[PDB]
Amino acid sequence: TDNVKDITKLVANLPNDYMITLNYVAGMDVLPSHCWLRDMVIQLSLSLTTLLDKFSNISEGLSNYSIIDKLGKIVDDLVLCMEENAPKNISPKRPETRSFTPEEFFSIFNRSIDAFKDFMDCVLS
Amino acid sequence: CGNNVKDITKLVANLPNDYMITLNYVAGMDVLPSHCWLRDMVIQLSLSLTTLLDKFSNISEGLSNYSIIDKLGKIVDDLVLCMEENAPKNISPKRPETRSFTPEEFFSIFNRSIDAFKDFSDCVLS
> Is residue A55 classed as helix, strand or coil in its secondary structure?
coil
B100: containing domain = 1-126
User: HSE of B33 in the Cβ direction (CA atoms, 13 Å)?
Assistant: 6
Q: Which of residues 11-40 of A touch B (CB under 8 A)?
A: 11-18
Task: Find all residues with CB under 8 Å of A64, minimum gap 6, and list them.
Answer: A10, A13, A14, A55, A58, B14
Residues in chain A: 125
- Contacts A16 to B, Cβ<8 Å: 55-56
Distance CA B53, CA B47 (A): 10
Distance CA A74, CA A55 (A): 19
**Resolution (Å) of this entry:** 2.2
CATH classification of the domain holding A41: 1.20.1250.10
Which of B56, B57, B62 is opposite residue A61, by nearest beta carbon?
A: B62
How many independent structural domains does chain A possess? 1
> Is residue B48 classed as helix, strand or coil in its secondary structure?
helix
Query: Taking CA atoms, what residue in B is nearest to A60?
Result: B62
Is A11:A106 a contact under the CB 8 Å cutoff? yes
| Residue environment code for A66-102, b if the CB has 16+ CB neighbours within 10 A, otherwise e | bbbeebbebbeebeeebeeeeeeeeeeeebeeeebbb
